[PDB]
Design a protein around this ligand. Structure first.
Ligand code: HEM
Ligand code: HEM
Ligand code: HEM
Ligand code: HEM
Ligand code: MW0
Ligand code: MW0
Lengths: 146, 141, 141, 146
């Protein structure tokens, strides 16, 4: 991924304000609510039967912290995303068989969560930079499918 | 296909936009043009700069078309037939671009209406925008 | 959104399919399971072997659903409400798999209809199958 | 992409029977009819206003010959589709900005045209092998997006 120096700085400054304990669970929860077929991959998490049950599910919140840490790793390795996510790609592709369009969906849900949390601070130029990041992460995760 | 709960959620959330229509539509377009520069190909005659008066006026037309779509949610192919003719017959907009603008509209709503943009409402607005997009990309006359 | 010409083509082409619809449904399933083996995860208790009586019986069910949708092409959400609950609410089928089965049905028709699978018929059937897929992947009941 | 030795044999055996002068134009023509937004990329080709115009359009037929020739090249280098399609990938992604979902659509239309020509010879196993090929071609063409 190619971010300008200004984009990298704006992305980093915003990400430093992200609640590491909550934003991942919020993004994963909204994926399961907005795109309910993704719940099929997470039946072991228990009750996902209503939006409130999804968003309040402790297994969703706990796994979301791991998802967010993977995005954090991507942000620390913007020039080598494919190597950073090689093992995650084999897991999601060779083992879980997640259709890669869903990678794009989670990235865009994360963008919606950042916009929801930061309001007017999530400016169009900051979003543009985050779209490059989440596209890179999704491409890297889909790399082993190819 | 929208549920009764979906229509309730979309009417409730979109009704709060109101006179922000032009500002919020222009913001969604600006987000799209900056985030996905390939979309700019459809607007060659447009000034696409940040505070462009062209984008501000076009954004109001888009937002108001959505308000009309919300009012005719049970009747969208009929209500939006002229727009479908424009986007599908004349402009030949690639369906992917509707997903991009729809996402940028959700981002814009999330940035401005945090209390309203719940997971359930997010989910309903996504389906509504997907439904609008299907009409605008279909050639049905 | 289907045009009047689309609906004419779909009713004509599915008429030409005729009594072979059940066979073609079974052939489309077999093609899907072989070409896109990830789809087999939705059918863990099925005998999916070539020419299994279970797949032939399920193909008849899929075809009869499509025949009913052709007969109710102006009213598919109402016609397919129970199937939508099964696929979207209970089974949570990823919408990508509907594109796969729809493609395999089109391949099956192409393989069996060398005299009638015209470009216009191909285009109209694609829109029909996409419309059915939207209904079956929507939670509206 | 992979393809078992039996899948390789089935694929090349069928391709030896494909008419190189017409099948590419039929696939491109049906893409323009079935997915009409794709006509936006072909304004220099002339009248595309009806299915009869599309399928008889001389520029569609001539260009389709080149498209089919690119597929033939892919079939000759199944273990290096990415390199084989490198020049076309930069053309379609960096110059034309064709959305990569359309590569998958054209590959699947080609599969339909093969089924149309070969009938019962286009067996499920033969189709499954060609789906691996056209997925590999589409991914290779989209490489400059990755
Ligand atoms: C950018 C997108 C994504 C990222 C960064 C991501 C990241 C991760 C991470 C870090 C793990 C934990 C791996 C481990 O414990 O070794 C994981 C597991 C998992 N992911 Fe993803 N993921 C993404 C998208 C998706 C999507 C879209 C789906 C399905 C729709 C999915 C399904 C799963 C499942 C089922 C697990 C295992 C959960 C469990 O049973 O504990 N992932 N992912
Ligand atoms: C929810 C989705 C959309 C809605 C509701 C919408 C609505 C509208 C409206 C109301 C107009 C103006 C009608 C008029 O002025 O007479 C318009 C024009 C236009 N739209 Fe869209 N649109 C949507 C998506 C898109 C997308 C995704 C693109 C391409 C990226 C696009 C490209 C255009 C273009 C090029 C025009 C003509 C502008 C001009 O030259 O005046 N639209 N649309
Ligand atoms: C045109 C698209 C489709 C149609 C018209 C259709 C129709 C049907 C019908 C009629 C049934 C039987 C209903 C009953 O027994 O009461 C069924 C069941 C089922 N369908 Fe579909 N279907 C479609 C696509 C799909 C796809 C793409 C998948 C997954 C890849 C899928 C997975 C299933 C499963 C798992 C069952 C239940 C089988 C069982 O346990 O007996 N369907 N569908
Ligand atoms: C997916 C398989 C595809 C293959 C194998 C393929 C192959 C080719 C080839 C061989 C050329 C000629 C390059 C040259 O002469 O230098 C070409 C050009 C072109 N392709 Fe594709 N193509 C594919 C898909 C598409 C799609 C899906 C679109 C658009 C919807 C598209 C749009 C174009 C255009 C606009 C040109 C230039 C035509 C002109 O104005 O001369 N291609 N392609
Ligand atoms: C009702 C509904 C949800 C998604 C779509 C796409 O046309 O429609
Ligand atoms: C009429 C139509 C074309 C494509 C779709 C998807 O629901 O519907």
């Amino acid at each position: 991924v190619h971010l300008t120096p200004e984009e990298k700085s704006a992305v980093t400054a915003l990400w430093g304000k992200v609640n590491v304990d909550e934003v991942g669970g919020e993004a994963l929860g909204r994926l399961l609510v907005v795109y309910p077929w993704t719940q099929r991959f997470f039946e072991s998490f228990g009750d996902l039967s209503t939006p409130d049950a999804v968003m309040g599910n402790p297994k969703v919140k706990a796994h979301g912290k791991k998802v967010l840490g993977a995005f954090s790793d991507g942000l620390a390795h913007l020039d080598n995303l494919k190597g950073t996510f090689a093992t995650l790609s084999e897991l999601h592709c060779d083992k879980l068989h997640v259709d890669p369009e869903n990678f794009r969906l989670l990235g865009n849900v994360l963008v919606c969560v950042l916009a929801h949390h930061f309001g007017k601070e999530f400016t169009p130029p900051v979003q543009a930079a985050y779209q490059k990041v989440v596209a890179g992460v999704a491409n890297a995760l889909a790399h082993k499918y190819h | 296909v929208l549920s009764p709960a979906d229509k309730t959620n979309v009417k409730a959330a979109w009704g709060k936009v109101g006179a922000h229509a032009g500002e919020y539509g222009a913001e969604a377009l600006e987000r799209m043009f900056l985030s996905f520069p390939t979309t700019k190909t459809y607007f060659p005659h447009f000034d696409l700069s940040h505070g462009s008066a062209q984008v501000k006026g076009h954004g109001k037309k888009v937002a108001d078309a959505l308000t009309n779509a919300v009012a005719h949610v049970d009747d969208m192919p009929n209500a939006l037939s002229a727009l479908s003719d424009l986007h599908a017959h004349k402009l030949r907009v690639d369906p992917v671009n509707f997903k991009l603008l729809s996402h940028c509209l959700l981002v814009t709503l999330a940035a401005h209406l945090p209390a309203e943009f719940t997971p359930a409402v997010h989910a309903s607005l996504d389906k509504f925008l997907a439904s609008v997009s299907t009409v605008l990309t279909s050639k049905y006359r």
